[PDB]
Design an enzyme around this catalytic site. Structure first.
Site, PDB file in Angstrom:
ATOM      1  N   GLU A 162       3.116 -10.723  16.698  1.00 28.48           N
ATOM      2  CA  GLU A 162       2.427 -12.237  16.985  1.00 28.48           C
ATOM      3  C   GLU A 162       0.752 -11.409  17.447  1.00 28.48           C
ATOM      4  O   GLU A 162       0.616 -10.802  17.287  1.00 28.48           O
ATOM      5  CB  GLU A 162       2.891 -12.284  18.823  1.00 28.48           C
ATOM      6  CG  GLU A 162       3.004 -11.180  19.618  1.00 28.48           C
ATOM      7  CD  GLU A 162       3.121 -11.617  21.335  1.00 28.48           C
ATOM      8  OE1 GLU A 162       2.460 -12.828  21.221  1.00 28.48           O
ATOM      9  OE2 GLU A 162       4.131 -11.383  21.761  1.00 28.48           O
ATOM     10  N   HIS A 193       2.568 -20.906  25.679  1.00 35.52           N
ATOM     11  CA  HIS A 193       3.344 -19.887  25.873  1.00 35.52           C
ATOM     12  C   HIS A 193       4.683 -19.557  25.403  1.00 35.52           C
ATOM     13  O   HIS A 193       5.568 -18.931  26.773  1.00 35.52           O
ATOM     14  CB  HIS A 193       2.988 -19.795  27.694  1.00 35.52           C
ATOM     15  CG  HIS A 193       2.442 -18.854  27.929  1.00 35.52           C
ATOM     16  ND1 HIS A 193       2.705 -17.635  29.881  1.00 35.52           N
ATOM     17  CD2 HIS A 193       1.335 -17.242  27.078  1.00 35.52           C
ATOM     18  CE1 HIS A 193       2.253 -16.699  29.253  1.00 35.52           C
ATOM     19  NE2 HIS A 193       1.677 -16.417  27.785  1.00 35.52           N
TER      20      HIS A 193
END
Lengths: 87, 108
Positions: B71, B100
């Site tokens: 990520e 998130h």
């Protein structure tokens, strides 16, 4: 930095995330999921940290609790300065 | 500074690596990064956190034997981290999250 979980007051997984959010001073955008928790323990949270988790088993019933504990342990495994007290 | 969803997504697919403005969490720490201080741009101007393994703990991204995820932070310039991330697989599937990690969108 000390965080306290009163396991007997946790009536759902959301309760758990809500407590974590306050106790760890997590970001307002906090995702309330395990990936969001990992991100915060590794790129937000202040150390050294002391996690005092009371009545773990009651919380377990109600949630879950184990998966969350597991994220804290991996974060520690990886080097974050986290003391975990299971009462 | 390539740090937008499309610039980084195109870069990944074209060069099979992240742009040079990215550094892992360990690397950053190595330069003096203290997440709670929000001092990344002070210790590594122009850098953004990115490249760490993504364990897909909620199982929301598609899995496959041999596939690993990573990520990177998106839209970061300085201060504390935001909620935007780009997720990329070892076989170059690319997803994004702006909330998130609650939800993901396939973008490549």
């Amino acid at each position: 930095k000390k965080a306290v979980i009163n396991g007997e007051q946790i009536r759902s997984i959301s309760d758990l995330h809500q407590t974590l959010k306050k106790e760890l001073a997590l970001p307002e955008y906090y995702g309330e999921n395990l990936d969001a928790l990992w991100d915060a323990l590794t790129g937000w949270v202040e150390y050294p940290l002391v996690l005092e988790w009371r009545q773990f088993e009651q919380s377990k019933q109600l949630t879950g609790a184990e998966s969350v504990l597991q994220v804290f342990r991996e974060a520690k495994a990886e080097g974050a300065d986290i003391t975990i007290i299971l009462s | 500074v390539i740090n937008t969803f499309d610039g980084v997504a195109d870069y990944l697919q074209t060069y099979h690596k992240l742009p040079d403005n990215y550094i892992t969490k360990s690397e950053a720490q190595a330069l003096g990064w203290v997440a709670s201080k929000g001092n990344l741009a002070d210790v590594a101007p122009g850098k953004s956190i990115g490249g760490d393994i993504f364990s897909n703990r909620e199982g929301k991204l598609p899995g496959k034997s041999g596939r690993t995820w990573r990520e990177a932070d998106i839209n970061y310039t300085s201060g504390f981290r935001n909620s935007d991330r780009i997720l990329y697989s070892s076989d170059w599937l690319i997803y994004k999250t702006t909330d998130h990690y609650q939800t993901f969108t396939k973008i490549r």
